[PDB]
Amino acid sequence: ASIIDTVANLAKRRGFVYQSGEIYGGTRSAWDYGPLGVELKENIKRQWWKSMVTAREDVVGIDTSIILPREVWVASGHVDVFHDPLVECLNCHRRHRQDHLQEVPMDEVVCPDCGTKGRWTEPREFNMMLKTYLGPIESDEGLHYLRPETAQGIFTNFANVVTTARKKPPFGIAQTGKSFRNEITPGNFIFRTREFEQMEMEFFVEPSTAKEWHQYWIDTRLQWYVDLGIDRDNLRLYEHPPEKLSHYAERTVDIEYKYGFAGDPWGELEGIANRTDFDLSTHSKHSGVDLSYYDQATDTRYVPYVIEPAAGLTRSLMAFLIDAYSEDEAPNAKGGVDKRTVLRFDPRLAPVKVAVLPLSRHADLSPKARDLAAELRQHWNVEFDDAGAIGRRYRRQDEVGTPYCVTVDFDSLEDNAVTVRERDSMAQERISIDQVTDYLAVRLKGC
Amino acid sequence: AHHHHASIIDTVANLAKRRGFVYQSGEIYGGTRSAWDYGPLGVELKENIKRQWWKSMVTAREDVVGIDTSIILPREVWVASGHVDVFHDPLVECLNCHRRHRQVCPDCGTWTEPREFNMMLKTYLGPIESDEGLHYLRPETAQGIFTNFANVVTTARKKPPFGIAQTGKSFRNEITPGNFIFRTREFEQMEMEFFVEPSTAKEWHQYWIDTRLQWYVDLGIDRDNLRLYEHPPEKLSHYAERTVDIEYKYGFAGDPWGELEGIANRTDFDLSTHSKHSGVDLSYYDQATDTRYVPYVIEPAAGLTRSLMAFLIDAYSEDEKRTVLRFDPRLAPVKVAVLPLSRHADLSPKARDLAAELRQHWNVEFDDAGAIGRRYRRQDEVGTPYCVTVDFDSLEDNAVTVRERDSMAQERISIDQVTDYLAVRLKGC
Ligand SMILES: NCC(=O)NS(=O)(=O)OC[C@H]1O[C@@H](n2cnc3c(N)ncnc32)[C@H](O)[C@@H]1O
Ligand SMILES: NCC(=O)NS(=O)(=O)OC[C@H]1O[C@@H](n2cnc3c(N)ncnc32)[C@H](O)[C@@H]1O
Ligand SMILES: [Mg+2]
Ligand SMILES: [Mg+2]
Ligand SMILES: [Zn+2]
Ligand SMILES: [Zn+2]
C-alpha cells in the first residue's frame, strides 16, 4: 500500500480526521478534525502565528470576515476572472474540468464517470467562488461571495492598520482563517477541500525592493517547515510559468512537498507571490479611498508592492503528518523485535504532549498517577491510560506521536519518582515527581 | 457607574475603533455593524479569550475532548436537526420604505403581514446551479459534534459523562445588527456538548451553569455585571427542554442586560434525530451495566465575539485622569511594552534585544515615540499589564524599571531575571 493511504488510515483510525457528516454520506471534499487532529492543527497554526506575528516587530495580526461586501470581489477581479472551463459529458451529463481532463490542449477525451469518450459540450466558464444571500430577499442586492482568499480583508484594511498600529513599509499584516472554493473534484485525503483554512501574510514594501523581499520570504517560509521537522529533501520550489499566474500576481513561487501521490508525488504546499501594487491600486480606484502610503522621511507617496506567503493550514497538516510517519524496528517485551509505527512530530506540534501510564490498574498506583496527570494538565494536553499491558500502551502513544510517557510503578510509592520514556529513542530515565514538570518543560520547547 | 463597587458602549466602541481593536468589515465600500474585522489588538484579545476557554474546557479536563468540524455539512444534517423546518422568525415589511424588520418602523418613523423567514444562510456546491447543490452554512456548531458522537466515543475511548468541545464560525441571517459587535451575521461560538446518563442530566445542568459563570469571574468580569436568566417555554429553542442564559450588563440604552452564553438541556433530541434520519445508531452501550441508552446533552454555548465585547466593556475604567483597560493579564493583547527612555545608539539596541527575548514568549510592543509618560498612557489605554523602561542606569546595573499597569508601581529588576519576573505575573503564553 502507498504511504498516503497508510497515513490516511492511521489518521482515521485514531481520530485525527473524520469525513464531515459521514453518517449521511461523506466525501473527501469535507473533513472534520477529531480530538488529536484539532490539537495538531491548532499547534501548527500557533507556530505560524508565533513565527509571523509574535516574533516579528515588522508584522502585525488581523482577523477579517469570511463574508465581505460584494464590491470587494468585483474590485479584486475575482468576479470577472476567478473561473475555470467546464465541459459536460453528452452521455451522463456530468460536468468536469476541461483543463484537468486535458492533463496541454487535446480534443476528444474519456469521461471518468461513464467512460463514453469524445462526446462533450463546448466549454463554459464557471466561477469558483461560493455564493450566499444576505437579507430576506434572494436577489442581486443580497448576493455575497464567501471569500476565496483571506487576502482582500487585509488589503481593504491597509490604511486602517497603518494608522492604528503606526506601521510603515516594509511591514506585514498576517491572518488565519477559512476560505472557500467550489472545487469540482476532491483531492487525495485532505489535500483539496471546498472549505479550508489559510495562513496568509501581505508584506508591504517600497517597490524597488520587492524582488529582494520576495526571495527573503521564499527562503524564510522554506526554513519554517524545516525548523518544525520536515525533511528538507521532501521540499522543493516551483516557479509559475506565465500562463499559470493568478490575475493578481506578477511572479509566484510555490513551496511543494513530496506528499507521495501516485504518478507525480509532488504537490503544492504554499504559494509566495509578488502581487506588485495590483490589490491596493484596484481598491483605491473602486472605493475612492486612497490606499497609497506617504513616506514622511522623503516626502514621497507610493502604492506599496506586496509579497504574499499564503500557506494552507490543512495542507500543512497533511505534510507534517506524512513527513512524521515512520516505521522502525523496536524491541518488544518478549525479547523479540516488532515493526513499530511512530509519528516523529516536533514536540511543539504533537497533539498529546505527555501520557501518564500507571504500570497496572493496581489501586495503589492510581492515586499518584491521577494526581500527576492532574498536575500536568495545568500545562499541557495529557492522556491518562491504565488499560492493558504497559508496552502496548507505549506503542499506542508512539503511534500518535506523543513525545514522552511517564510510568508510575510500585517503586514510585517509595522513592516518589517516575520513569520518563522518550518516544524516538525509547530511552527511560527515572525522575523525581516534583521535577517532572520542569524536566518536560525543557524538552517540550513551548512558550 | 458601570462598576457600582455618553454611554459606556459608545465610549468603549470609540476606543476600540481608534486603537484598532475592530474595524467595520469592508469599510471603504460602506461598513455596517453586522460585520466586523479584528485589528492587531482585537485579534490578540479574541485569540486569548478563545485559548483560555479551550484550556479550561478541554486541556484541563480529563472528561472533555476537542473537535473541529466543517462550516458546510450535508444538507440532510439540518433537515434532521429540525433547523430547516423551525429555524425561522416572523418578518414584518414596512409599507413606506419597504424594509423588512424583526417582528414603529426605525427607518421611516411610522405594515405587512408577518411572514416566517428561515434564518440559515444558503450556498450552492458543485457545478449544477440549482437546488441539487443547495447547502446551508451552519447556524450553530453543535451538529458537527452530534454527528461525530459515535466516532469520538470509539477513537477517544470516552464514556458518559463526558464532553466534546469546539470553537468556530456560525452564520445567521440576522435582520438587523446589534449595538457594536453584539449581533452579526457571522460570529464565532465556543460550544461544548456534555453527554450524560439521562437521570443525571438536571444535576449536570446546574453544575455547568455554575462552572461557566465562574469562568467569566475567574477571568476578571465583575460578578455584579453577570446574572442568570431562565427561558420561559415560549422562548425555548426547538432542541431544548430547559435553557438558562448567562447575561452580561453591556449597558445598552433602556435595558442594559444582554445574553452572553446559553446553557441548554437538549435532552436526547439531537442524538435521537440523527440516529433516526441517518440509520446510524448514536446511542451509547454501557458494558458495566449491559444497558443501552441515548445520552442526554447539557450544552454550554458561548459566543466568542460577545465575550470579547463583555470583557472589553467590563475592563474599561477611568481613574487618576487616565483611561485604563483592566484586563486580566491572560487576556490582555499586549503583555509587555518595552520603552527606551530615549531613542539612542546606547539604549535602543539594549531595548530591542530585550523586546526580542520577550517576543519568544509574548506579544510585545516596542515604543520609542514621545515622552515616557505619554507612552505609559498609550499602553494603559489598551490594557498592557507591564511596561519595561530601559534607561541610562540600565547600562550600569543591567536592570530595567518594570511598571505595573493598575497601581503604576515600579520595581527595578535585573534583565536576566525580567522574563521569569514577568512570567509568574502574566500567568500564560
Ligand atoms: N491569497 C493567495 C492564495 O490564495 N494563494 S493560493 O491560491 O495558492 O492558496 C494558498 C494556499 O492555500 C491552500 N489551498 C488553496 N486551495 C485549497 C483547497 N481547495 N484545499 C486546501 N488547501 C487549499 C494551499 O496550501 C495553497 O498553497
Ligand atoms: N448551540 C446552541 C446555540 O447556538 N445557542 S445560542 O443560540 O444561544 O448561541 C450561543 C451563543 O452564540 C452567541 N451568538 C448567537 N447568535 C449570535 C449573533 N448573531 N452574533 C453574535 N453572537 C451570537 C451568543 O453569545 C449566544 O449565547
Ligand atoms: Mg508582530
Ligand atoms: Mg481533555
Ligand atoms: Zn460521462
Ligand atoms: Zn419604514
Residue numbers in the entry:
A (entry chain B): 2 to 104, 118 to 461
B (entry chain A): -19 to -15, 2 to 99, 124 to 130, 134 to 343, 353 to 461
According to the publication:
Glycyl tRNA synthetases (GlyRSs) are prospective drug targets for combating Mycobacterium tuberculosis (Mtb) and cancer in humans. Structures of all three forms – complete, or in some cases partial – have now been determined using X-ray diffraction or cryo-EM. Both Mycobacterial and human cells express the α2 subtype, and notably, the GlyRS gene in humans encodes one product that serves both the cytosol and mitochondria, which has obvious advantages for the design of selective inhibitors. Similar to the TtGlyRS, the two Mycobacterial GlyRS subunits adopt the canonical architecture consisting of an N-terminal catalytic domain and a C-terminal anticodon binding domain connected by a β-hairpin insertion. The catalytic core contains the class-II specific antiparallel β-sheet having the characteristic insertion domain after the first strand of the core β-sheet, and the anticodon recognition domain adopts the HGPT fold also found in HisRS, ProRS, and ThrRS.
In the present study, high-resolution crystal structures of MtbGlyRS and MtrGlyRS bound to glycyl-AMS were determined by X-ray diffraction to resolutions of 2.25 and 1.95 Å, respectively. The two groups of synthetases utilize different insertion domains, with the group containing MtrGlyRS having a zinc binding motif. A few of the modelled MtrGlyRS chains are more complete, however, owing to the presence and stability of the zinc binding site. The ATP binding loop orders over the adenine moiety, with conserved Phe205 docking at Arg329, Glu197 and Thr207 at the adenine N6 amine, and Arg195 at the glycyl-sulfamoyl group. This conformational state introduces stabilizing interactions with the YxG loop, including electrostatic contacts between Gly201 and Arg29 and hydrophobic packing between Phe203 and Ile204 and Trp32. The insertion domain also becomes increasingly ordered upon binding AMP and glycyl-AMS, as the lid structure becomes more organized. The two-stranded beta stem forming the base of the zinc motif head places Phe83 at the tRNA A76 binding site, where it packs between His79, Met142, Pro162, and Arg195. On the basis of the structure of tRNA-bound human GlyRS, a major conformational change must occur in this region to allow A76 to insert between and stack face-to-face with Phe83 and Arg195. Interestingly, the theoretical dissociation free energies estimated for the glycyl-AMS-bound states exceed 24 kcal/mol whereas the value for the apoenzyme model having more missing structural elements is less than 1 kcal/mole. AMP orders two tRNA recognition loops and a section of the insertion domain, and glycyl-AMS further stabilizes the structure, including the closure of a lid motif.
